Design a binder for this molecule. Structure first.
Ligand SMILES: OC[C@H]1O[C@H](O)[C@@H](O)[C@@H](O)[C@@H]1O
Ligand SMILES: *[C@H]1O[C@H](CO)[C@@H](O)[C@H](O)[C@@H]1O
Length: 142
């Protein structure tokens, strides 16, 4: 808004703003699919206990905030929600495919539309490091 149009800097910032919705979308997709993959690699009740403790702490903080302004069932529901992992094998294959595609897209966007050459490096290296889809491997190598 403050930048004067027709300027080079205005065009640069406009391009960065435009190619940022894709960055946010693919980063969120990759992050959530990575979380799913890591939690599915070994679904352990220790993670359930830790998440329940954190949710209880958040409940206590919210109650304290409500007090300043003037549990067990929810813990069990959250534990059940942890049991909402995809209990198949084609589903996790699709999730891994989505994660790899998100990494590839993020690397391509960083290299091309941002000229980063650093974040794209880790993106493509991590994509190549975890069983790529055999179609992205060679373009990512290039
Ligand atoms: O159609 C894609 C869709 O396939 C199935 C699951 O792996 C989902 O997480 C994924 O988004
Ligand atoms: C990412 O999100 C999934 C959603 O279930 C979690 O299970 C995982 O532990 C990580 O927080």
């Amino acid at each position: 808004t403050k930048l004067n149009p027709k300027t080079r800097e205005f065009a640069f910032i406009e391009k960065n703003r435009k190619n940022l919705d894709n960055v946010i979308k693919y980063e969120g997709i990759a992050k959530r699919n990575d979380s799913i993959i890591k939690v599915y690699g070994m679904p352990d009740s220790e993670r359930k206990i830790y998440f329940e403790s954190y949710i209880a702490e958040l409940k206590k903080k919210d109650e304290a905030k409500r007090i300043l302004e003037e549990v067990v069932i929810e813990k069990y529901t959250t534990a059940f929600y942890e049991k909402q992992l995809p209990k198949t094998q084609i589903a996790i294959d699709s999730i891994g495919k989505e994660r790899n595609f998100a990494y590839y897209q993020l690397g391509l966007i960083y290299k091309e539309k941002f000229k980063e050459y650093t974040l794209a490096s880790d993106k493509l290296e991590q994509l190549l490091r975890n069983n790529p889809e055999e179609k992205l491997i060679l373009p990512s190598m290039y």
